[PDB]
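Summary for the steering committee. One of the milestones for this cycle was to obtain a three-dimensional model of the protein with A1AE3 bound, which we needed before selecting residues for the alanine scan. The sequence and ligand used are listed below.
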Amino acid sequence: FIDPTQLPYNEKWEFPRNNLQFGKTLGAGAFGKVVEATAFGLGKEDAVLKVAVKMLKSTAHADEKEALMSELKIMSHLGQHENIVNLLGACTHGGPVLVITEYCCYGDLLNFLRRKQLSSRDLLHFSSQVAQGMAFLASKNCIHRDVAARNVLLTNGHVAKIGDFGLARDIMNDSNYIVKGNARLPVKWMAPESIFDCVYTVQSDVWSYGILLWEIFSLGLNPYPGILVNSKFYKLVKDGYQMAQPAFAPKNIYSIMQACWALEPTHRPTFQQICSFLQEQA
Ligand SMILES: COc1ccc(COc2ccc(Cn3cnc4cc(C(=O)N5CC6(COC6)C5)cnc43)cc2OC)cn1
């Protein structure tokens, strides 16, 4: 509404890089990595917290530095919310850019479902918490563009947080990211208007959230099982093909996924409508 995506960075986030003790790496991409670390004296409470630090790798420059900066500026304007991976601080002077975020000890939702015991209440909680996080991003005018279980983290209490590995995801070597022109795109998660027109809105995040609901209630099957991404798959999604209901999905949840897969983006529900319906279902 009142703010576009052009604001500079808020120095209030700055944290002294010498109070960071790096630990194990948590994941890496072509130009970025995410490392565990301990922050020594972070915030008002002077905590010594385990954190995750996003940073560029040995080999990058130019737009890569900018893209991390842009990631940092984007997160500094969201603010804090329980159901996202929140920014805690950053080091932008005296060295390479470091983006300090919450550490989610249980890892990503997808491997959690695959490692699994769960319950029907546990899947509805995951679905609702992700929906709250997406509603918060929506209300900030922020288009996620990679909504999927591999980008949802579980932290203490097995509370779900939506985030994005961004530069720290090895996209070049992940078959879920399809070669399409000069881009690697998570086609199986993507709204048709976004695959074809490269149109990305809140409503296209809603489609991807429906795919994410299917992942949750299948306990982490790959979407469109057995169906390879090619021209025929594109014709299927455009013609209105929808995956069948997951075995553990109550009919009410499946109806949410179908509403999310409306071919007309205005006919999908908003994230707040999904929160309220998930809310009543409890
Ligand atoms: C909508 O816009 C937004 C919103 C938010 C964001 C920021 O998102 C992120 C920021 C930082 C990280 C890094 N990050 C933190 N905790 C993590 C735990 C693991 C793990 O695998 N774990 C825990 C373990 C126990 O052994 C170690 C196994 C991996 N990486 C971890 C991940 C992010 O997103 C998923 C971006 N864009």
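Key point for the committee: The helical segments are 63-78, 109-115, 120-139, 192-197, 202-217, 231-239, 251-260, 271-280.
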